[PDB]
Design a protein around this ligand. Sequence first.
Ligand SMILES: CC(C)[C@H](NS(=O)(=O)c1ccc(-c2ccc(CSc3nc4c(c(=O)[nH]3)CCC4)cc2)cc1)C(=O)O
Ligand SMILES: [Ca+2]
Ligand SMILES: [Ca+2]
Ligand SMILES: [Ca+2]
Ligand SMILES: [Zn+2]
Ligand SMILES: [Zn+2]
Length: 160
Amino acid sequence: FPRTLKWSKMNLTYRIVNYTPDMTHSEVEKAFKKAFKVWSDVTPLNFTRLHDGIADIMISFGIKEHGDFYPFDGPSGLLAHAFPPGPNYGGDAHFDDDETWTSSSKGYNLFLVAAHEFGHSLGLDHSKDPGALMFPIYTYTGFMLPDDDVQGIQSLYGPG
Ligand SMILES: CC(C)[C@H](NS(=O)(=O)c1ccc(-c2ccc(CSc3nc4c(c(=O)[nH]3)CCC4)cc2)cc1)C(=O)O
Ligand SMILES: [Ca+2]
Ligand SMILES: [Ca+2]
Ligand SMILES: [Ca+2]
Ligand SMILES: [Zn+2]
Ligand SMILES: [Zn+2]
């Protein structure tokens, strides 16, 4: 307790509030869209992007103290966090812009980190399977959602 939790609805919205200097707008948008599709492809979840106003999953880049009780720490250490399902900060995902975000093998691959963090946004906890997306340690192995993660998200939301 309290490891997992699910949204009471499956039509979810998201908003990209701001953009990292590290990547182009298009690269950031592609990364987040692909990261949501990881989860919608195997469940009844569907994700719609909003360009303004409140969305369920608010996405932002920030440094140090950025508006919650979970400050970032400069280069290294923490790279991102996401709140469990619920109102207000619930579901929101924050990325530490004192890290280097990429669409490549350098730095942290934004797609891979976002896909993991959106798992947390949807109520998943970590896996003990080193091959799982939800494993606690970041690696870059070169995308198909591993079966451990498929089982985890389908146990909350059912299959697609
Ligand atoms: C609980 C908080 C404190 C923590 N924040 S953090 O900054 O310490 C943090 C640490 C690690 C991660 C991360 C990102 C991507 C991954 C998959 S990497 C990966 N996965 C897969 C493949 C791959 O190549 N790489 C192939 C299939 C699955 C694994 C861990 C994110 C954030 C957290 O959010 O977990
Ligand atoms: Ca950091
Ligand atoms: Ca929210
Ligand atoms: Ca950066
Ligand atoms: Zn935060
Ligand atoms: Zn995690």
